[PDB]
């Protein structure tokens, strides 16, 4: 059988090809004994007191190989429960990943785990392949990085990619910060979870930000209540959309980036003029941080206004967009016509990690 594994800063979604949903979903963290012997995932989170925590993937790029090596070990043996020697493994990388990083992924896959074969693809491509498409621009928005990724006939256009170094993680802080600013106490990492649960259950993108500011002030209709595990009722009103707006107006945390809507526009205008129309109608979204209600609506509005007045603009926000990366990699890796794309061990033995190119 073929394995599918998506390596995020935030979450390692894993499982088997031909499945519609990953069996293993866990934080992307290696833990080691602080003093005086190692855990991965939810077991590294639950024992964060006596273990030194680490995010080997931060911002999409694998930064430390021993840690990520421990996280691949754990994916095989604990979460999935497989012998890696007998399964093709499709691994996903970030956009604009350095060659050296991509060479090291292959070198390690054939040499530590001795896979029968492997392939690497690009997340954005995989969320496109999931929606039925091979052309278009994908908004990929995870825990620690965000991307615009244009794609023509199956392939990402590297020179036209755009990156926003702000994702779900940054919107949690900002919220945490904002509720703090209003009398509340949210310091430790382990209180963060509360705020994150506030962020996901309750936050939303304002279709128009100033109308919405006007609405939250003139009425109680947008006020929400959430009950801490300690007993207090936090009533949030405008916090609900002020948090996610940071995607479109990042200077809410002090950045210089334009929002995900201009970067969607730029990333289209660095493309062949004749493919542009196809991007505009195929603007698919993906990642947990694109899960906010009203995002594809607000995107539509912002692009319409940036794009010539007659341009058909369609934004696709598949209801399962949180897993599309993996869902695309599951589909890809089982089709009959992909099977001879796998780098085999013997191609590798004769060519080296540079074959991955």
């Amino acid at each position: 059988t073929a394995l599918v594994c998506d390596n995020g800063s935030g979450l390692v979604k894993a499982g088997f090809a031909g499945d519609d949903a990953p069996r293993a979903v866990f934080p992307s963290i290696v833990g080691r004994p602080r003093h005086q012997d190692s855990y991965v995932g939810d077991e590294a989170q639950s024992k964060r007191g006596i273990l030194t925590l680490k995010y080997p993937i931060e911002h999409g790029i694998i930064t430390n190989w021993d840690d990520m090596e421990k996280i691949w070990h754990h994916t095989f043996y604990n979460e999935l429960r497989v012998a890696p020697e007998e399964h093709p493994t499709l691994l996903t990388e970030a956009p604009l990943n350095p060659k050296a990083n991509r060479e090291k992924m292959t070198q390690i896959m054939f040499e530590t785990f001795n896979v029968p074969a492997m392939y690497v693809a690009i997340q954005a491509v995989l969320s496109l392949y999931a929606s039925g498409r091979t052309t278009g621009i994908v908004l990929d928005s995870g825990d620690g990085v965000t991307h615009n990724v244009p794609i023509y006939e199956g392939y990402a256009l590297p020179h036209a990619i755009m990156r926003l170094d702000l994702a779900g993680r940054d919107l949690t802080d900002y919220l945490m910060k904002i509720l703090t600013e209003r009398g509340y106490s949210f310091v430790t990492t382990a209180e963060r979870e509360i705020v994150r649960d506030i962020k996901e259950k309750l936050c939303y993108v304002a279709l128009d930000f100033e109308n919405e500011m006007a609405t939250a002030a003139s009425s109680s209709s947008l006020e929400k209540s959430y009950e801490l595990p300690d007993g207090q009722v936090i009533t949030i009103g405008n916090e609900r959309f002020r948090c996610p707006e940071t995607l479109f107006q990042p200077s809410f945390i002090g950045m210089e980036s334009a929002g995900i809507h201009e970067t969607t526009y730029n990333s289209i205008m660095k493309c062949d003029i004749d493919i542009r129309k196809d991007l505009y109608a195929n603007n698919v979204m993906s990642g947990g941080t694109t899960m906010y209600p009203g995002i594809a609506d607000r995107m539509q509005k912002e692009i319409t206004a940036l794009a010539p007045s007659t341009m058909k603009i369609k934004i696709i926000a598949p209801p399962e967009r949180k897993y599309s990366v993996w869902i695309g990699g599951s589909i890809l890796a089982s089709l009959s016509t992909f099977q001879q794309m796998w780098i085999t061990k013997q191609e590798y033995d004769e060519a080296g990690p540079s074959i991955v190119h």
Partner: peptide, 21 residues
Amino acid sequence: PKVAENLKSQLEGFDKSKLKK
């Protein structure tokens, strides 16, 4: 110059309904 077109076809034609649960 041959590998793409068939993969494109399987990819665009795929029914996700075909994926196990």
